[PDB]
Write a protein that holds these residues in place. Sequence first.
Motif, PDB file in Angstrom:
ATOM      1  N   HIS A   1     -47.170 -19.797  31.312  1.00 50.14           N
ATOM      2  CA  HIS A   1     -46.553 -18.512  31.577  1.00 50.14           C
ATOM      3  C   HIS A   1     -45.340 -18.719  32.482  1.00 50.14           C
ATOM      4  O   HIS A   1     -45.028 -19.840  32.890  1.00 50.14           O
ATOM      5  CB  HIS A   1     -47.507 -17.551  32.294  1.00 50.14           C
ATOM      6  CG  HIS A   1     -47.956 -18.165  33.591  1.00 50.14           C
ATOM      7  ND1 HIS A   1     -49.002 -19.055  33.627  1.00 50.14           N
ATOM      8  CD2 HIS A   1     -47.515 -18.060  34.863  1.00 50.14           C
ATOM      9  CE1 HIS A   1     -49.203 -19.462  34.859  1.00 50.14           C
ATOM     10  NE2 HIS A   1     -48.310 -18.871  35.638  1.00 50.14           N
TER      11      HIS A   1
ATOM     12  N   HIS B   1     -42.871 -16.893  35.799  1.00 47.65           N
ATOM     13  CA  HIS B   1     -42.623 -15.936  36.874  1.00 47.65           C
ATOM     14  C   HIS B   1     -41.108 -15.743  36.965  1.00 47.65           C
ATOM     15  O   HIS B   1     -40.336 -16.721  36.916  1.00 47.65           O
ATOM     16  CB  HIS B   1     -43.230 -16.398  38.188  1.00 47.65           C
ATOM     17  CG  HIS B   1     -44.683 -16.720  38.222  1.00 47.65           C
ATOM     18  ND1 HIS B   1     -45.632 -15.877  38.764  1.00 47.65           N
ATOM     19  CD2 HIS B   1     -45.382 -17.815  37.805  1.00 47.65           C
ATOM     20  CE1 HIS B   1     -46.837 -16.418  38.671  1.00 47.65           C
ATOM     21  NE2 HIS B   1     -46.705 -17.588  38.092  1.00 47.65           N
TER      22      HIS B   1
ATOM     23  N   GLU C   1     -41.139 -19.360  42.238  1.00 50.93           N
ATOM     24  CA  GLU C   1     -42.226 -19.300  43.218  1.00 50.93           C
ATOM     25  C   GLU C   1     -42.020 -20.465  44.183  1.00 50.93           C
ATOM     26  O   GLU C   1     -41.848 -20.269  45.381  1.00 50.93           O
ATOM     27  CB  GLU C   1     -43.587 -19.328  42.529  1.00 50.93           C
ATOM     28  CG  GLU C   1     -43.945 -18.111  41.714  1.00 50.93           C
ATOM     29  CD  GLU C   1     -45.422 -17.869  41.493  1.00 50.93           C
ATOM     30  OE1 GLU C   1     -46.147 -18.782  41.037  1.00 50.93           O
ATOM     31  OE2 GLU C   1     -45.927 -16.750  41.749  1.00 50.93           O
TER      32      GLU C   1
ATOM     33  N   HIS D   1     -44.875 -22.390  34.327  1.00 54.86           N
ATOM     34  CA  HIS D   1     -46.132 -22.995  34.711  1.00 54.86           C
ATOM     35  C   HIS D   1     -46.929 -23.366  33.450  1.00 54.86           C
ATOM     36  O   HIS D   1     -47.255 -22.386  32.781  1.00 54.86           O
ATOM     37  CB  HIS D   1     -46.967 -22.048  35.589  1.00 54.86           C
ATOM     38  CG  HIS D   1     -46.338 -21.849  36.946  1.00 54.86           C
ATOM     39  ND1 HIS D   1     -46.694 -20.850  37.829  1.00 54.86           N
ATOM     40  CD2 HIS D   1     -45.356 -22.562  37.546  1.00 54.86           C
ATOM     41  CE1 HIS D   1     -45.954 -20.964  38.921  1.00 54.86           C
ATOM     42  NE2 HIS D   1     -45.129 -21.995  38.776  1.00 54.86           N
TER      43      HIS D   1
ATOM     44  N   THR E   1     -51.354 -19.256  42.062  1.00 54.45           N
ATOM     45  CA  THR E   1     -50.537 -18.322  42.871  1.00 54.45           C
ATOM     46  C   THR E   1     -50.839 -16.848  42.643  1.00 54.45           C
ATOM     47  O   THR E   1     -50.134 -16.013  43.241  1.00 54.45           O
ATOM     48  CB  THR E   1     -49.055 -18.628  42.595  1.00 54.45           C
ATOM     49  OG1 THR E   1     -48.728 -18.277  41.243  1.00 54.45           O
ATOM     50  CG2 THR E   1     -48.805 -20.124  42.778  1.00 54.45           C
TER      51      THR E   1
HETATM   52 CO   LIG Z   1     -48.094 -19.264  37.569  1.00 55.45          CO
END
Ligand SMILES: [Co+3]
Length: 256
Positions: free
Chosen positions: A90, A92, A102, A115, A194
Amino acid sequence: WGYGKHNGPEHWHKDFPIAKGERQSPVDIDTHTAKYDPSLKPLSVSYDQATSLRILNNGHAFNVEFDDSQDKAVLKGGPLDGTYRLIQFHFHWGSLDGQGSEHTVDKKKYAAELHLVHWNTKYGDFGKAVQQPDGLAVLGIFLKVGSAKPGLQKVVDVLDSIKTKGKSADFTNFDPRGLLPESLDYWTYPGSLTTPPLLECVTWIVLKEPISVSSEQVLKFRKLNFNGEGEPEELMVDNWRPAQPLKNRQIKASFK
Ligand SMILES: [Co+3]
């Protein structure tokens, strides 16, 4: 939990005390502080037999899920012992190009971060793996806005069909190798998930070399929805947690 003002990252600790844990992610990577480690073996990313099967909008992000019932796509080597199976990936990202990642590097924020989640096969399944200190290995790759990433377009062009919370769509034959940069030089440290429940089960492997995606590409991400269908519209943007205390950890480098 969410990313909003009343249920964002600085609220998670109330339902999830491990948020103020000793090995929380993400963190800032200070490059002059990371020590080169030569006993690290080269990364081995074995993705040619990868089987993707679905994409889903889960209310936080969109996950591209893989068949992990066999040793198809696996990560090994680097700082890793044993073998790690890919289960999903996925992203972010932010509401603007200047934020969204992140991890950061010498406080610099990238427009987004990818990720690729793997679970250690010695624990049999992902549910059991997340209860272990070396349960997961996550590959983290930064996105910068520049020319488009050909490998990403097929992901971008399905988001319309999964615009709201709970919707999914078949996603087979996607090859995650097209999202990798040229270099596998990396940094690595021990950390966590996270998002809630924030379990401290992850060996983080963060590539030094970003990938480039187009502004158009990132803006389609920004069209998704956190809400459910027929619900009030809230755009899926700024689904990133900020950097956490490094605490008693050492970040190691694979390159001189
Ligand atoms: Co992630």
